[PDB]
Amino acid sequence: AMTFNIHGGYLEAIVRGYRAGLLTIVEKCTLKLVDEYKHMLPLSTFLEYITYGHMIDNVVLIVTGRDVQELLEKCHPLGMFDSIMRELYRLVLVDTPLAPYFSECITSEDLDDMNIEIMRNTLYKAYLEDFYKFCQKLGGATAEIMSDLLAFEADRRAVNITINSIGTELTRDDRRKLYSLYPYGHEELAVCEDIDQVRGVMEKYPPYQSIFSKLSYGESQMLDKAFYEEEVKRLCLAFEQQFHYGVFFAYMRLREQEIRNLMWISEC
Template identity: 70%
Template structure:
């Protein structure tokens, strides 16, 4: 059934976990309200998970939501940056520099987890680093950014590091159209087998299709994270998939609001992934249940030396 209005979307969402967050909204619903309430539900889920974790899982979850104001870097920005520095180009360079530091730190942290967590998170973060390298290269066209400056923004890990980064950094846009520039970048990346299908299927200069292809590839990788159990990567994958779900809901809502229902099917996620996500969420709660049992077992054995007992308890 295709929804005709945003109220129809609200009615369908009322039967889901988003229902309680939308039930008190007035009938004149807007797409931003749907986005806001779905995000609020997502944030509440994150807080619930964070409250039931201990180290190193709590630090792992905090990495996903780190913001600049809560880090030791904040004072340096007030001391070293003036309003004159905050033009469009400098802000983008600053944002990418900070994100590079963040993702590299997150990557190093995941290397210490060991087991399936390290294996899966290394793959997911490496994919993100590879995607950033391509996007930075394409988005830096027509701005005063030297090859060395461009390479400084690339993360120091991933499949493209270091040789792919060298090829991307030397791509110049002098006397080239944007479409040709994008095509040259894609040609340089086709030699990497895991990304061959992404770049080889793109037509001449289709940068927007490149973003869509990366999103689809990411969703598949996130779903595969649920193939193994009892590792922190399932939480990262779950949260990323929920973010994608909210983006899909926003896209559908915008299509309905603008009477462009024929474009609804152009959402990034594919229908075949829905079964995998449901299966993955079941495994997620299996993981959380097992994690909670391990915490109870550890507490019981830690307190047994002090002759602490809970009378009448079945645990």
């Protein structure tokens, strides 16, 4: 308990103040948040993992090429850092947590990362590796939030697979082999081929019960949006942010959600 006052107290106070102050306009807000995060530079590993979260997607996008030069336009330092096509993939395998594992898991390069569906599969595998790495750094209450996020991503991928991607070889086995209680009981979603079946599978977790509801919204989207939208709706739990705990990831997630809401506002 005394370690917080021993070190990291000032950074924690600054992060708490910045989060409390938070609430091309979307691009400007994202740039301001990224600058605030960068200026803040134990917690170093947490910041590295938080950045690597979006850096996995940034590297996946940069893996194209095929109009690859356009990736510089979205070079947001929050996720699109320069430090984080097999020949170039081997070079990019450094300075990232999920990259060494993806080097072997996605050794087929574009063959296993086709832009239609297999690129999404490689992105999901990288996200699973990053989630495993983040969960490895256990010791705080953020483990529950990380597990919830990974479960939401896995369940959304499984729902998308059962909806229409089953014809894209995303079968029941692929619901966990390629599509990133879920780390132990994800087998219940392998047969949830229907919206009613999805609700029944969600009934296995009473907290996840009634989250799907009519499933008209949230679950209607493919990729990782089905159960991820449930996490977005329940993010009010993340809004608690009890003191003397790692809240940098929570602040980053809140800033990202605010940026997304501002983008969704657009022209009213």
